[PDB]
Design a protein around this ligand. Structure first.
Ligand SMILES: Nc1nc2c(ncn2[C@@H]2O[C@H](COP(=O)(O)OP(=O)(O)OP(=O)(O)O)[C@@H](O)[C@H]2O)c(=O)[nH]1
Ligand SMILES: Nc1ncnc2c1ncn2[C@@H]1O[C@H](COP(=O)(O)OP(=O)(O)OP(=O)(O)O)[C@@H](O)[C@H]1O
Ligand SMILES: Nc1nc2c(ncn2[C@@H]2O[C@H](COP(=O)(O)OP(=O)(O)O)[C@@H](O)[C@H]2O)c(=O)[nH]1
Ligand SMILES: Nc1nc2c(ncn2[C@@H]2O[C@H](COP(=O)(O)OP(=O)(O)O)[C@@H](O)[C@H]2O)c(=O)[nH]1
Ligand SMILES: [Ca+2]
Ligand SMILES: [Mg+2]
Lengths: 439, 50, 66, 54, 33, 412, 429, 429
């Protein structure tokens, strides 16, 4: 019951999933070897690990995750790391040659010889689940594998699994910094998949996470490890509603109905608070109102897209820990009283609240100070057209004289696919503007 | 054997950081190049004694 | 005519219909037969402009479900 | 014919502290720290419960 | 005098240890209330 | 049926028959990283020559871990001196060394033998290391080697020749130095042990001699956790029985003198490794030192191989990083204080409170916070081995103290 | 996965000899083939460059290949010579005479049968060949002509596999061969039309590095080839060791070659300190990037000031944090947008490897597709016009079977490449 | 199952002498005829080539054949010459003159009755004789003529028994007999209709293998005979020893002879490695396949590049995995379809035996019915036509009783055979 299948695609998805699972194992009680102490279990009928782990008769708790990469450079690290015993030897699928920042290579030449094995692993994960809420795919559309093979896997999953919910946590290209030159191409090519075959899309660009780590975690050397730790914390905060009981329990579709107003309007920004260091934790009034204000501030958000420059459509706040409904409602009221953030006219309430009694647990050697109360934001807002317009401008600049297009053409794509993807993303941005426009 | 112990003991090579080598090969005074390719079938392979 | 290689094979060939399972993963080491090229080398028949070998796989239209 | 001169040999230990120089690809062990989790009702409580009613 | 044969080029690309302002790539403007 | 289980080289599959003795051995050191390593080698009697290899399991091309071998000591006719007493004299002259040198013998390659190859041929080891033979196969052996020299130096087990310390430095091929303790030094050691049981560790003798091991946590290049005179004086001060009123100058001086001559007695009782004086500042100099192992053989009894291996197995199961360190959170999540008789039937202690007390037992590592070294673990179970006599009881205690999965995680 | 390396000519053979010395030191390989290494990660991915034998001896996937067996004798009698396989040595009976025609059509045509016979074996001896890497000099006869013949046949047989050609481009000031313009012009268009990513290296820039960047007293070709060995190891460190942001040869090609003909890059290594200079500089990501983009550190002699960077790539090594490295690699663009290209946002590719080189805190290798290599191409072409206009040193090539219009069509490719570089440098948005 | 061997001429005598050297070493049989081996499998099937006497001495089932008793006495003086039965040495009084005419018609006939008598006695002694075997040279006088006579008479007397023949082919480079074209022409048209299959052995191929591949400074004719005897012994490895996939001489014939006249094969052995190079390589089934299909290891001097493999057979020795021996046979066809015939899917038969030869990890004998035997046939036909046009050395054959019609129809048969191979070389599906 309440299972959610994690699908990590690409290198970035692999490290994000590694962080997510090292957080989940310590959250529930599972050791790095995959076993679970009898004490980390209320009784014979305890089932918190059920949604994320399957209990084997030999005592292991195998995660319900599929790691998937076209090169072994990350799965071998996983199999040499601390969770080799935890992770199933299968459901850890790797290829031989990487797509090498090529959507064409990941979606038309080498992703096609991997997608059916990936689907078989996904099916063997799902048939073990009697109450599967949905899939949670972690990837970065910046690279080649996560864009191409991610799109292929999303398409085939949408084809074969019908109307199962699909949360795509994707690391979009950042407005300023990037680690590729064909990354705008990859993002523009994968945006159609992220729009149609991803039921709810979440933006996790490295930029806002880096700035947040610098300014709030007091970390002079932020890195991918810290970014993935924070992303895993956000994922755990969102999905803990069905893991631990609370005053306002929600499920996947339960917050999806309140989050998604229209089928094409499902891209939602994310934020987390109080994401602060141990030194800063004992210097600040970590109240529910304070953490809610930090959430609604762009400082705490994980995507470089200012909502105060746009209009909110539906904000879902997952509170965890010692929160109280009165504190939640008072925070919501003092957020309405602020005029820096405007809700769309046709959505008077625009607020979903989900309260969970389990406070977040910090990984040892981590950076987040474990705070007794926390809150995560999944907000649908019209401001998100900013990032799509900017990546469209980057794509237009790159494609003005058809640079770097010969690989995409020669690895199994028509020249018109770029134009089709560009017009699809332009239509997406235009429909965000139409829905955000006043009556 | 003590002599066998010293013979086993060997010096481990320094790391080859670029730009820190100083042309050590110039201090050989005899540069005769034995013709080990084309006239030698063994190609000067080194094999230990029995 | 050829019937096509069976699904879920661990044996890989070149330019044939391939199952989506990771068949290439199980390729083992291969013995090759050389072909004489010194005879084909000809100073008169030389390298032209635009004559380089480019690996271009055919592009097949893929329908997108909306 | 004069005999050839012997090849000049460099000393094996030019620097007084050459021994300290490390020659291992991974010299330092990975840094790892751990803190004991605070035991509380949150550790085992607040867990979803399923029973058959039987 | 025998002079070394050096390429006649000079350096042009310079960076810093913590170049960007406050190690924040972009800082959101504040709208008052 | 004969060849169904046969390999490429089974005796039935091969038409040729070979003469060799195949021995698996493991290195002896305080380092858990080294103790994890497994070694295999073989001895050919035709040439009286044996080779040694280390096996490591890391992922191959197919995505799953594979075992492969790294030359630990290449094939060679290794020679040991016939006379350990005359080894020093033979080292002076080349001809005397040749006369004294003898090749190894098949009798040397029995189980539990402690063999020494000399300087390492690989960089995995930084000094001369001892190899304990854990298994021997003589199925393909057809001939028995005999030493040509009249006097024979044979590798022997530590249990085979007790009250001896093996020192690789003094003589090539490994040698045994007897340890002589009189009744005075012996019962002084027992009293020091008992004062540690009472004062540093509280009521619990396990924590008592765990507190003993505190000044002796560093592991040298050759393993063999050493005791310098400063370490011994720290041990005497930690024994804590030698106390004085701080306001009384005469009493303070008397206590200091008692600590000094107690340290002198303890240090001089045990055999000393000769100090080294390297010419260059780079090469490490070692002071006069005694082995923590030979000291603890007397101060807490003798531990047998099964007990030692059970200790190592528990440590390996608790250690996931394969870095010879256990996190305090791992210690917390695996202590089984909750099903403990005292909390369940006796109700003297509560589960959480006993668990947090056990967490407080482990001292903080200066280098890495929240990490429990294998020296920590070995000293703590030295406590249990000292306090109990029955090997079956020790095995049961190790089975029941840690809620470990007991799966076989050794690569072999 | 695996990378197979061929080394042509005396220059390329010495380059590969020092490269294999460096790789053997990095992976802990004794010259006697037996393993001697230090960490587990060394043998996690040693098979990319080494094939194992029955006894565990590791033999490089190296094809030593040249008409003069003297360099073969030198490399095999050297310190790490006993590492190479015997059959991997291919030798003729007479030298190339520094003649592209002799190396490419008369002498190299007879040896190419055995060259390809051993090269196919070494290429299919691995589970998944990533690509080919040929080290050579364009000024010589056997290194340039016969090496490009090998490149053409290897591309014909393996169209999809990636190709690198570490070519040591000559310079008139350091002209160590008078037919260097002819040989270079004949080989550059072969590289253009049959090499996935060439690698231009110039003795002028290496010597400038040795004089001012290193301040070496008497640096010999061993010291000089240490740098090319460093960059050759750096371009595959991502394959050989795990990293936070891994990459590969096809990764570099895709992120660095905007158009098929523009695949020529200029190299650079950092850190690279002078003799008495370590105590005067603190090794950090900032100074790594400063020396990487630093002009004199470019080990190909062409001033980046006069050109604009089409693409750049930085293969950083060592345990780091990605935020500082991409801070540096974005801020360099931010305050040097004049030296970059506007219509390609973020001309820079970044890769991170978790294993630093032997005895270094950090390191980086630079791949630079700067448009100012058109200056080197034009300087080669002008002197090619000078020699070809008077038929000087042309009777050798004509009598070795080649036709005169070969030179004309190669220089036509030169002019086309120069024109493409110029019209992509001056193009606007 | 028993195989009885015949040794025709001095070529056959020395070849069979070294063959019995190899067989005695394999079965642990000393020259005195006793057994000092260390395995039961030596006695398990020792009856295939040996017959035990009353005293336990193992006499080989061998017949020796020569007009020249000089080679007879040399074999007797050999280290293992006492093994053969004294009555199995059949010799004449006059030499063969290196003449097929007097080796097949005049002097061959006066001894053919006695040699048939002794062969018949050997077949009687055999519990159920599976195959006659012959070792000889087509270019000789008595090895060729009397060998053809005996194989023909064996064909009529034993039509249901396998007829192995091991024929040494001449070559212009090695040519040490001016009438090699005549003898080969007169012998090929006998072996076509009198031998079930006939692999060809060529001395320049042997020399090339022992020089370029095996790298012996002074390889002797003795270990050249050892090299041929290795395959001659491995052809019946499954006959003499158990295996997961056994096969015998008829199994080879039926899986290697698509049509009755197309039965001219080539040997191949692996691992044939120079001692100075096999320290550098790791013995494996994959490179055993690489060698067996490699042109330089083809111990008949006719490349497979210009021909298409009708059928092939790989008899592996040593415990192995069936696919690691099977993909190496399959994907070779998959990737070299230009060198394999389409209308014969899976051209290679594989066989596995548990016992490998002495001092080896594992071995393999390759037997290929490649279409390139037409090259040898065309060469010998052209040489024969050149000599026959001027009737050179024809008087030595016509004075012994032949007529030109025999030569004309033998040459016509060989030309039909070369046309016959060419038709399937260029045949379409
Ligand atoms: N959060 C996070 N993002 C990462 C990490 N590693 C890479 N990325 C992001 O991934 C983007 C590029 O994708 P890649 O790293 O190449 O991974 P990929 O999508 O699988 O592409 P390939 O490497 O070609 O397979 C970069 O812009 C990074 O922002 C990581 O460890 N954590
Ligand atoms: N409590 C312990 N549990 C497990 N291993 C230990 C413990 N204490 C020490 N060791 C290690 O076990 C090994 C035993 O050391 P050593 O060979 O000197 O012992 P010994 O007393 O001479 O002989 P024996 O091993 O036969 O008991 C060393 O590597 C030591 O570091
Ligand atoms: N870096 C480096 N360059 C070299 C070396 N040997 C030769 N060269 C360069 O190669 C050019 C001459 O080419 P050459 O070596 O004769 O080519 P070959 O005739 O094909 O072997 C000269 O300009 C040298 O600068 C070497 O060992 N290292
Ligand atoms: N393999 C092998 N070949 C041989 C031997 N003797 C001769 N030959 C080859 O056979 C050819 C000539 O055979 P020949 O001596 O006339 O045979 P003969 O008629 O019995 O004397 C030559 O080309 C030799 O290379 C031998 O003992 N072994
Ligand atoms: Ca650990
Ligand atoms: Mg990747």
């Amino acid at each position: 019951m309440r299972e959610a299948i994690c699908i990590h695609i690409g290198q970035a998805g692999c490290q994000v999933g590694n962080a997510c699972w090292e957080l989940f194992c310590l959250e529930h009680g599972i050791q790095p070897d995959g076993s679970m102490p009898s004490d980390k279990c209320i009784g014979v009928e305890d089932d918190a690990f059920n949604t994320f782990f399957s209990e084997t008769g030999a005592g292991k708790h195998v995660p319900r995750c599929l790691f998937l990469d076209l090169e072994p450079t990350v799965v071998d690290e996983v199999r040499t790391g601390t969770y080799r015993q935890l992770f199933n030897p299968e459901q850890l699928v790797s290829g031989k040659e990487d797509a090498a920042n090529n959507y064409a290579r990941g979606h038309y030449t080498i992703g096609k010889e991997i997608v059916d094995l990936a689907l078989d692993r996904i099916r063997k994960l799902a048939d073990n689940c009697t109450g599967l809420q949905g899939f949670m795919v972690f990837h970065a559309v910046g690279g080649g594998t996560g864009s191409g093979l991610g799109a292929l896997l999303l398409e085939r999953l949408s084809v074969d699994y019908g109307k199962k919910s699909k949360l795509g946590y994707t690391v979009y290209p950042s407005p300023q910094v990037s680690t590729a030159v064909v990354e705008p191409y990859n993002c523009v090519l994968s945006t159609h998949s992220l729009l149609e075959h991803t039921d709810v899309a979440t933006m996790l660009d490295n930029e806002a996470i880096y700035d947040l780590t610098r300014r709030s975690l007091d970390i002079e050397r932020p890195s991918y490890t810290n970014v993935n730790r924070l992303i895993g914390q956000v994922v755990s905060s969102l999905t803990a509603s069905l893991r631990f009981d609370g005053a306002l329990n929600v499920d996947l579709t339960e917050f999806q109905t309140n989050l998604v107003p229209y089928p094409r309007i499902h891209f939602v920004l994310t934020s987390y608070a109080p994401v602060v260091s141990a030194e800063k934790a004992y210097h600040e009034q970590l109240s529910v109102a304070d953490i809610t204000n930090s959430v609604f501030e762009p400082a705490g958000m994980l995507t470089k897209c200012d909502p105060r420059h746009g209009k909110y459509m539906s904000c879902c706040l997952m509170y965890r820990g010692d929160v109280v409904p009165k504190d939640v409602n008072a925070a919501i009221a003092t957020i309405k009283t602020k005029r820096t953030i405007q809700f769309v006219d046709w959505c008077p309430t625009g607020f979903k609240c989900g309260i969970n009694y389990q406070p977040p647990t910090v990984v040892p050697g981590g950076d987040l100070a474990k705070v007794q109360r926390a809150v995560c934001m999944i907000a649908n807002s019209t401001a998100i057209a900013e990032v799509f317009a900017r990546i469209d401008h980057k794509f237009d600049l790159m494609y003005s004289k058809r640079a770097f297009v010969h690989w995409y053409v020669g690895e199994g794509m028509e020249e018109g696919e770029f134009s089709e993807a560009r017009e699809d993303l332009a239509a997406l941005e235009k429909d965000y503007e139409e829905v955000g426009a006043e009556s | 054997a003590y002599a066998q112990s010293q013979k086993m003991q060997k010096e481990f090579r320094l790391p080859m950081v670029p730009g820190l080598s100083c042309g050590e090969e110039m201090m050989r005074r005899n540069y005769d190049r034995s013709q080990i390719h084309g006239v030698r079938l063994d190609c000067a392979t080194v094999i230990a004694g029995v | 005519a050829e019937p096509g290689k069976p699904s879920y094979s661990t044996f890989f060939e070149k330019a044939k219909e391939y199952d989506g399972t990771n068949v290439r993963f199980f390729k083992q080491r291969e013995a090759v037969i050389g072909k004489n090229v010194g005879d084909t080398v000809d100073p008169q028949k030389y390298l032209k402009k635009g004559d380089g070998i480019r690996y271009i796989v055919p592009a097949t239209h893929e329908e997108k479900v909306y | 014919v004069p005999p050839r001169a012997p090849d000049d040999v460099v000393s094996k230990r030019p620097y007084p502290f050459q021994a300290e120089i490390n020659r291992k690809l991974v010299p330092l062990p990975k840094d790892q720290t751990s803190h004991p989790r605070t035991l509380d009702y949150t550790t085992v409580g607040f867990h979803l419960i399923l029973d058959d009613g039987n | 005098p025998v002079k070394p044969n050096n390429v006649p080029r000079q350096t042009a690309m310079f960076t810093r240890k913590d170049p960007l302002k406050r190690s924040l790539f972009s800082e959101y403007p504040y709208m008052p209330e | 049926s004969v060849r169904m289980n046969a390999s490429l080289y089974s005796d039935v599959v091969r038409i040729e028959r070979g003469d060799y003795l195949r021995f698996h051995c493991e290195q002896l050191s305080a380092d858990g990283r080294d103790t994890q390593r497994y070694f295999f080698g073989c001895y050919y009697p035709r040439w009286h020559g044996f080779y040694l290899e280390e096996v490591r399991s890391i992922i191959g091309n197919m995505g799953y871990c594979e075992l492969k071998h790294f030359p630990a000591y290449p094939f060679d006719v290794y020679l040991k001196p016939a006379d350990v007493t005359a080894a020093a004299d033979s080292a002076k002259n080349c001809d005397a060394d040749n006369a004294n040198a003898t090749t190894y013998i098949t009798d040397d390659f029995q189980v539990d033998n402690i063999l020494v190859l000399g300087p390492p041929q690989n960089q995995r080891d930084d000094a001369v290391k001892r190899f304990k033979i854990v298994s021997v196969d003589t199925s393909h052996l057809k001939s028995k080697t005999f030493s040509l020299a009249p006097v024979a130096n044979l590798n022997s087990s530590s249990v085979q020749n007790p009250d001896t310390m093996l020192s690789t430095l003094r003589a090539p091929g490994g040698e045994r130095v007897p340890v002589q303790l009189n009744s005075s030094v012996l019962d002084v050691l027992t009293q020091l042990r008992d004062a540690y049981i009472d004062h540093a560790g509280g009521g619990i003798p396990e924590i008592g001699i765990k507190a003993m091991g505190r000044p002796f946590r560093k592991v040298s290049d050759d393993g063999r956790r050493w005791m310098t005179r400063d370490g011994v004086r720290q041990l005497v001060r930690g024994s804590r029985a030698f106390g004085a009123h701080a306001d009384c100058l005469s009493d303070t001086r008397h206590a200091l003198q008692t600590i000094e001559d107690m340290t002198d007695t303890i240090f001089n009782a045990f055999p000393h490794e000769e100090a080294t004086y390297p010419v260059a500042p780079g090469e490490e100099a070692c002071e006069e030192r005694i082995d923590y192992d030979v000291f603890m053989d007397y101060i807490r009894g003798h531990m047998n191989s099964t007990r030692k291996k059970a200790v190592f197995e528990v440590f390996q199961q608790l250690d996931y990083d394969s870095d010879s360190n256990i996190t305090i959170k791992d210690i917390q999540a695996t202590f089984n204080a909750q099903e403990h008789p005292v909390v369940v039937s006796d109700a003297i202690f509560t589960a959480e409170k006993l668990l947090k007390g056990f967490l407080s037992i482990w001292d903080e590592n200066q280098r890495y916070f929240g990490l429990v070294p294998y020296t920590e673990f070995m000293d703590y179970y030295n406590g249990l081995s000292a306090i109990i006599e029955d090997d079956a009881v020790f095995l049961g205690i190790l089975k029941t103290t840690w809620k470990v999965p007991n799966w076989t995680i050794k690569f072999v | 996965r695996e990378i197979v390396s061929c080394q042509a000519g005396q220059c390329g053979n010495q380059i590969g000899s020092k490269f294999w010395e460096v790789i053997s030191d990095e992976h802990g390989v004794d010259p006697t083939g037996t393993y001697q290494g230090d960490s587990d990660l060394q043998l996690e991915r040693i098979n990319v460059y080494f094939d194992e034998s029955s006894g565990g001896r590791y033999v490089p996937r190296a094809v030593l290949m040249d008409l003069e067996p003297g360099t073969m004798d030198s490399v095999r009698a050297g310190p790490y010579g006993q590492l190479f396989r015997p059959d991997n040595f291919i030798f003729g009976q007479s030298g190339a005479g520094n003649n592209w025609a002799k190396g490419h059509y008369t002498e190299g045509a007879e040896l190419i049968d055995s060259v390809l016979d051993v090269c196919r074996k070494e290429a299919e001896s691995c589970d998944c060949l990533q690509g080919f890497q040929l080290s050579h000099s364009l000024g010589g006869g056997t290194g340039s002509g016969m090496g490009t013949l090998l490149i053409s046949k290897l591309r014909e047989e393996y169209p999809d596999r990636i190709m690198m050609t570490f070519s040591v481009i000559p310079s008139p000031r350091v002209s160590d061969t008078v037919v260097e313009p002819y040989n270079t012009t004949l080989s550059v268009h072969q590289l253009v039309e049959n090499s996935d990513e060439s690698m231009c290296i110039d003795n002028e820039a290496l010597y400038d590095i040795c004089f001012r960047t290193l301040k070496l007293t008497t640096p010999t070709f061993g010291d000089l080839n240490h740098l090319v060995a460093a960059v050759m190891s750096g371009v595959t460190c991502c394959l050989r060791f795990p990293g936070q942001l891994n990459s590969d040869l096809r990764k570099l090609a895709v992120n660095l070659v905007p158009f098929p003909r523009l695949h020529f890059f200029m190299m650079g290594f950092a850190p690279l300190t002078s003799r008495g200079s370590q105590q005067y500089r603190g090794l950090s990501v900032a100074e790594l990037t400063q020396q990487m983009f630093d002009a004199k550190n470019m080990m190909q002699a062409a001033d980046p000031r006069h050109g604009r960077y089409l693409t750049a790539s930085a293969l950083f090594r060592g345990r780091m944090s990605t935020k500082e490295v991409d801070e540096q690699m974005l801020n360099v663009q931010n305050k040097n947008s004049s030296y970059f290209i506007e219509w390609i946002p973020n001309n820079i590719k970044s890769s991170i490897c978790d294993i630093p080189p032997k005895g270094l805190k950090m390191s980086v290798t630079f791949i630079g597709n700067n448009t100012c290599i058109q200056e080197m191409f034009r300087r080669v072409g002008e002197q090619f016009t000078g020699m070809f206009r008077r038929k000087a040193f042309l009777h050798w090539y004509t009598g070795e079977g080649m036709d005169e219009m070969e030179f004309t069509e190669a220089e036509s490719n030169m002019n086309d490449l120069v024109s493409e570089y110029q019209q992509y440098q001056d193009a606007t948005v």
